[PDB]
Amino acid sequence: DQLRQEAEQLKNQIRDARKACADATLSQITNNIDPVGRIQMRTRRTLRGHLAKIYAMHWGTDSRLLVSASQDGKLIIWDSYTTNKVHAIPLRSSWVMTCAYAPSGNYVACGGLDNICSIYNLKTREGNVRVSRELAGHTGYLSCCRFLDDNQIVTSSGDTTCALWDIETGQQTTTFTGHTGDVMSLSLAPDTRLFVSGACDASAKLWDVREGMCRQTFTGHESDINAICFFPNGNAFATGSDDATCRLFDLRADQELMTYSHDNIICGITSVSFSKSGRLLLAGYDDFNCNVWDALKADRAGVLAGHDNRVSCLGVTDDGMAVATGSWDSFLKIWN
Amino acid sequence: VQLVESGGGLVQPGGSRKLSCSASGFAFSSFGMHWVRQAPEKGLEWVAYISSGSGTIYYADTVKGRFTISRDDPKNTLFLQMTSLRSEDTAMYYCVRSIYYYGSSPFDFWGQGTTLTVSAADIVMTQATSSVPVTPGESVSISCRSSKSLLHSNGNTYLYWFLQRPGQSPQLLIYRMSNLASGVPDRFSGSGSGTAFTLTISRLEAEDVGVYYCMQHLEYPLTFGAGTKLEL
Amino acid sequence: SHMDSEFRYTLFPIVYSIIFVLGVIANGYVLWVFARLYPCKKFNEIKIFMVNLTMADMLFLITLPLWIVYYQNQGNWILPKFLCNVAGCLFFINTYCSVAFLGVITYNRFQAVTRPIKTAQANTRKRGISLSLVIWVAIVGAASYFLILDSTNTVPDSAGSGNVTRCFEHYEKGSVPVLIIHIFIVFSFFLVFLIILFCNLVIIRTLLMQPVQQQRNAEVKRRALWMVCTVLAVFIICFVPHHVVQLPWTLAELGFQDSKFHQAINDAHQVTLCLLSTNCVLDPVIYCFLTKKFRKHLTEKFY
Amino acid sequence: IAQARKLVEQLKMEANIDRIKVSKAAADLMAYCEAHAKEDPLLTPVPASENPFR
Amino acid sequence: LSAEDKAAVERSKMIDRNLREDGEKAAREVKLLLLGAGESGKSTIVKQMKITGIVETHFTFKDLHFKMFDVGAQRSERKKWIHCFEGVTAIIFCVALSDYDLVNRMHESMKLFDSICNNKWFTDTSIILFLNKKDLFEEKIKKSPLTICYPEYAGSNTYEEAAAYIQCQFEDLNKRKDTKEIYTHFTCSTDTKNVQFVFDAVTDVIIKNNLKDCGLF
Ligand SMILES: CCCCCCCCCCCCCCCCOC[C@H](COP(=O)([O-])OCC[N+](C)(C)C)OC(C)=O
Description:
heteropentamer; B: about 230 residues; mainly beta; Immunoglobulin-like; 2 domains; 6-stranded mixed beta sheet; about 0% helix; C: about 300 residues; mainly alpha; Rhopdopsin 7-helix transmembrane proteins; binds the ligand CCCCCCCCCCCCCCCCOC[C@H](COP(=O)([O-])OCC[N+](C)(C)C)OC(C)=O; membrane (chain D)
């Protein structure tokens, strides 16, 4: 009976606490910063060969090997510097939705509507990629997956709960619960000590890999969260939802700092990515193109309209030399 | 993995002979195959090669025309037909496996080999060092001088160090001089610039006793080294 | 030859010029769309035949000005003597390959409508390319003979220098080769048409079968029927009169059958070539500009 | 009874988080940006002689 | 300008040929999406047809292959995984007629049908509505008045009329009728004919696609 009143009181208390820190807006601080100007990129290489919609793609720790995932049931390993296919992993479930690339380059994860995360080992004595481990136990479609080490992987499912799986064992080590909607995105910090998850509740929850509890819950959106990307520094992150507006949260400020939205954009944000310096925010939209925003002084710096279908995923290399953009048109283009 | 060679023995000069290399324990269809001969008390030498799926075949100009290499993926067997055999073809033929892609390690596994006795422009790999007795517990340095600059435009220099133990088949010690093969201890380092290369062994062990071969993989006319024998 | 209609010098120039403009614009648009819409993944046998038809029509148009100027010069050829044969052969090879491509396209449509399952689960690029190359090579080989054969003739005229050098027309007393090729074309064309008519009639019957159960694709079926009927009517009205007047006119000019109604047959033959060019323009319009997307792209641009 | 209890527990735990002024956060953000501005191949152009994408 | 990259290019072209072969092989297989308000209507047809999350049933009929994808176990948000089946050949929606007096069930079925029919991705996808449980419905209609489900049903309690009224109410949900086709049919546990019905419904869409590709429509 009194628990709901106490919850409302705590909500108002945290609201007032966050408001007390709202001294000045990011624009008031960045007024002294010069504009970035027009940013025009060139499609250096187009990676064609898929026979279905490309839904997910991830970059490796070498800036040359990138994994792709489409609805055709194939996982292609592309060599960025030569557009050559290195490996072609056949999938048992063509309904894939996410893909990951291990930091060392020896394992790649894949999941989707099968409620199973399949790990494939690339470094084997044979000449064929074999299944390492099949992690099962989720009651929802796998939305995103990212590796922490060679024996641990964080996976978000469409059951309001995330899970940390240990590969060599195959069981769950930490179940992160607290969401009220289907978890759609995951982004791990550079230190791999804490990761943020965006779900279908207009809220992004931060989680630690060891304890297993929610530290901060950032709100402000008005629709389902579809993309999230951690800031290179590791103390902030951007989140894009179907409301046609990206929002930057800071773990230290504990609230929003600035939003990215234009009156002409009315569609959702499917993917978001940051540059090496964090000054350029890449945003993939359903208008068959991607846009670049200034992280400090919100302004659209350029457009990467080079696809015929929705831009599924975006990826910026660790060195920030090029940007791989995938779309449902079966093409993955490398802009630079 | 397993590669068994058959068809060796005493062959008359000028006769025909078919050698069969049976493979097992891997995707034979997705691995290129090489033939590397080794005459009695002499260095290695490449003979022929087939790529994955028999898409590109290569032969050595020294024995071009007389050797016919073919593959059988359904049965996973590499056939080598030889006609007009001369007194120089007497040697032990090794059936080597390889694979080519970004980060690959070619020439990983070498077959046991088959002995065959017959009764009766290229990149020269100058291996000045022939034999050097070294005591255990000390550092060893094996030099390799090449004729042509193996440093390709892309950057990755193609040069392979192999080690052959007495009475055993050689194995891939180092590929590209900067990446160790799966199964080699962390005691062999490579350092190469232009045409000079050096293999450094920190701690010598009994298993390291053997002949070292420096083979360049810049042009398909592969030429092996002379050999560097060590002792325990 | 002596039979010379004078209205052809005043009729062909402007008609041919307008046809050239319209057809070259249409072929440029069609090539633009086919190049920037259908990648290697989206090239089927029907699309291969359609792009070959576009190229053929384009070549025919590129050749038209050479005859426009000829007819503007009172049927007197001034350009080199070899360009005359070049253009005369280009004209015929383009027209007759276009006819063959239309025929094979109608045959493919027949196969797809009658046997949808057996056609939707098969690759046709190989057969399409093979048939295209075979037809092109055959037509080029047939035209090479008349390319090397002298086709110019000095016909006198009522003037001090009336030695008009006719180009690919007005031949002298009968020439067996010309009759042979004319007869050949007439026969081949008629055979192809009998095939096209059979295909179109079978498609019309299959569409208007009126199933006992509720019709699922009423709108689709009606649009397909209208397009097929339009294409068939255009092809008929444009080509059939040509080949009716063509052979009898040939026989009359070559002196084999100097039958009455020479001037009437000649006049009926001039409007038939007019129809052939009008068709060259109409075919791509009715084929591409109204299929599924050209209307969509036009609306998008205008919207 | 457990749902609301966990809810209030999470609320108070999030309320126990430290407070920081947004001005300092923006200052740190702009400092990190200007510190790595020269190391951004996208923010600033890069010669093709060294760019790995010819 | 290559020392050993030729082998990598050969491998790449070979795996490209392999992917192309697999694509052209999987391009001649019909894809069906099974949906329903309850397992009662879905599992009956799943087991009636010939030979974890999603369930893939592959069956061949008259040299034509069909892969039916059942996503009933996926209780997550449908809006986040329904877009994957945009290129589905047809949507087989099963509804149990013997469910109006087993409370509201038919209301949820109609809601789901309207949601999947007027969706952004299924603007032109064909829908085959299988009304199962014919015997139980004919048996219970005599006892339970149909007015409980349709308060505006001013008719007789006979089957040949109540079934027609239900079919009309289900077909009146498509706000756009000229672009979509609804294949309504009644079935039971011993019909064995639904295979031919689905085959005809798929051949219709195949003929439509051929007319589109052949240069018509
Ligand atoms: C599938 C359909 C038919 C397929 C068979 C295809 C075979 C292709 C044969 C190639 C024909 C080569 C040309 C030699 C054909 C020989 O044409 C000779 C002329 C041209 O007759 P015309 O119609 O009055 O031409 C005047 C029109 N202009 C002057 C504008 C050109 O005829 C005379 C004067 O007797």
